[PDB]
Design a protein around this ligand. Structure first.
Ligand code: HEM
Length: 153
């Protein structure tokens, strides 16, 4: 059993969560640019986080596209060994530039609430799909935060 497979076991990951995320994917995807911008605005609004923004104009576009791509993979999958390998590398990037890990809590909270809103917008008229999507979002984001934080060892 791989470490990432173990983590999946711990949160109760299954095919149902992968179906649910893919179901939200097509509906949320058009919103990704706005979600990335909102996320980046939260960074700009936080004195400490914004000290990472030393790369000038090019960095602004890079933060946007990276987060769009991240959200795309988040919801589209697959959530296999290659996926979690890449998430581990993403984590390490933040560790190597010196971002304190406590920022990641706040940052995952942004996505939690933002993706929860999109799920409601698409699925309010289909209560079982809404509930299931929400539980899938909780699981995937718990995995994501667990992996990111693990890179700080
Ligand atoms: C849920 C939280 C976060 C996710 C999913 C995330 C995602 C990513 C991804 C996908 C990359 C590109 C990694 C690569 O090179 O392969 C990245 C790079 C980066 N992230 Fe984050 N990030 C998060 C939080 C933060 C926070 C809070 C900051 C605060 C400033 C930050 C600043 C950066 C910086 C500075 C880079 C390097 C690239 C650049 O500056 O253009 N990230 N992040």
């Amino acid at each position: 059993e791989t470490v990432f497979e173990e983590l999946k076991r711990y949160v109760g990951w299954g095919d149902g969560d992968e179906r649910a995320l893919r179901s939200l994917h097509g509906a949320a995807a058009p919103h990704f640019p706005r979600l990335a911008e909102e996320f980046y605005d939260r960074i700009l609004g936080h004195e400490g986080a914004r000290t990472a923004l030393v790369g000038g104009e090019s960095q602004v576009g890079h933060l946007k596209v990276t987060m769009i791509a991240w959200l795309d993979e988040l919801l589209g999958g697959p959530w296999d060994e290659a996926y979690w390998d890449r998430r581990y590398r993403i984590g390490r990037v933040h560790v190597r530039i010196g971002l304190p890990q406590h920022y990641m809590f706040g940052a995952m909270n942004v996505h939690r609430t933002g993706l929860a809103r999109l799920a409601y917008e698409r699925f309010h008229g289909d209560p079982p799909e809404l509930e299931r999507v929400r539980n899938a979002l909780g699981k995937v984001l718990d995995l994501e935060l667990a992996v990111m934080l693990h890179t700080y060892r």
